[PDB]
PDB file of C-alpha atoms and ligand atoms in Angstrom:
ATOM      1  CA  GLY A   1      19.160 -15.358   6.795  1.00  0.00           C
ATOM      2  CA  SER A   2      16.196 -15.253   9.167  1.00  0.00           C
ATOM      3  CA  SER A   3      13.943 -18.211   8.369  1.00  0.00           C
ATOM      4  CA  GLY A   4      10.346 -18.272   9.565  1.00  0.00           C
ATOM      5  CA  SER A   5       7.896 -17.577   6.750  1.00  0.00           C
ATOM      6  CA  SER A   6       7.019 -19.653   3.686  1.00  0.00           C
ATOM      7  CA  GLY A   7       3.857 -20.658   1.850  1.00  0.00           C
ATOM      8  CA  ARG A   8       2.363 -21.249  -1.589  1.00  0.00           C
ATOM      9  CA  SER A   9       3.185 -18.141  -3.622  1.00  0.00           C
ATOM     10  CA  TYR A  10       3.854 -17.758  -7.346  1.00  0.00           C
ATOM     11  CA  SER A  11       6.936 -15.652  -8.074  1.00  0.00           C
ATOM     12  CA  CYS A  12       8.359 -14.594 -11.440  1.00  0.00           C
ATOM     13  CA  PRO A  13      11.932 -15.928 -11.752  1.00  0.00           C
ATOM     14  CA  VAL A  14      12.144 -13.956 -14.999  1.00  0.00           C
ATOM     15  CA  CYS A  15      11.716 -10.379 -13.784  1.00  0.00           C
ATOM     16  CA  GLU A  16      11.783 -11.054 -10.040  1.00  0.00           C
ATOM     17  CA  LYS A  17       8.182  -9.827 -10.034  1.00  0.00           C
ATOM     18  CA  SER A  18       5.258 -11.016  -7.910  1.00  0.00           C
ATOM     19  CA  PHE A  19       1.519 -11.296  -8.554  1.00  0.00           C
ATOM     20  CA  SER A  20      -1.711 -11.646  -6.577  1.00  0.00           C
ATOM     21  CA  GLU A  21      -3.437 -14.235  -8.764  1.00  0.00           C
ATOM     22  CA  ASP A  22      -2.062 -17.550 -10.027  1.00  0.00           C
ATOM     23  CA  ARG A  23      -3.308 -17.105 -13.593  1.00  0.00           C
ATOM     24  CA  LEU A  24      -1.727 -13.659 -13.903  1.00  0.00           C
ATOM     25  CA  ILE A  25       1.846 -14.882 -13.450  1.00  0.00           C
ATOM     26  CA  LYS A  26       1.240 -17.515 -16.127  1.00  0.00           C
ATOM     27  CA  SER A  27      -0.089 -15.110 -18.758  1.00  0.00           C
ATOM     28  CA  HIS A  28       2.340 -12.378 -17.706  1.00  0.00           C
ATOM     29  CA  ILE A  29       5.456 -14.428 -18.446  1.00  0.00           C
ATOM     30  CA  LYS A  30       3.848 -15.665 -21.663  1.00  0.00           C
ATOM     31  CA  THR A  31       3.206 -12.177 -23.038  1.00  0.00           C
ATOM     32  CA  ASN A  32       5.720 -10.120 -21.060  1.00  0.00           C
ATOM     33  CA  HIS A  33       8.370 -12.819 -21.482  1.00  0.00           C
ATOM     34  CA  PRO A  34       7.793 -14.237 -24.990  1.00  0.00           C
ATOM     35  CA  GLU A  35      11.345 -15.489 -25.522  1.00  0.00           C
ATOM     36  CA  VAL A  36      12.894 -14.761 -22.124  1.00  0.00           C
ATOM     37  CA  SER A  37      12.526 -18.107 -20.356  1.00  0.00           C
TER      38      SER A  37
HETATM   39 ZN1   ZN B   1       8.008 -11.665 -15.217  1.00  0.00          ZN
END
């Protein structure tokens, strides 16, 4: 509902998980989610 906060963040639409780095989310999904994309 309340809208007033948005930026450039990389979220994991696979396991609704978040990461600090931008290269972590990429590798994570790759390994963690091998055939779940
Ligand atoms: Zn994930």
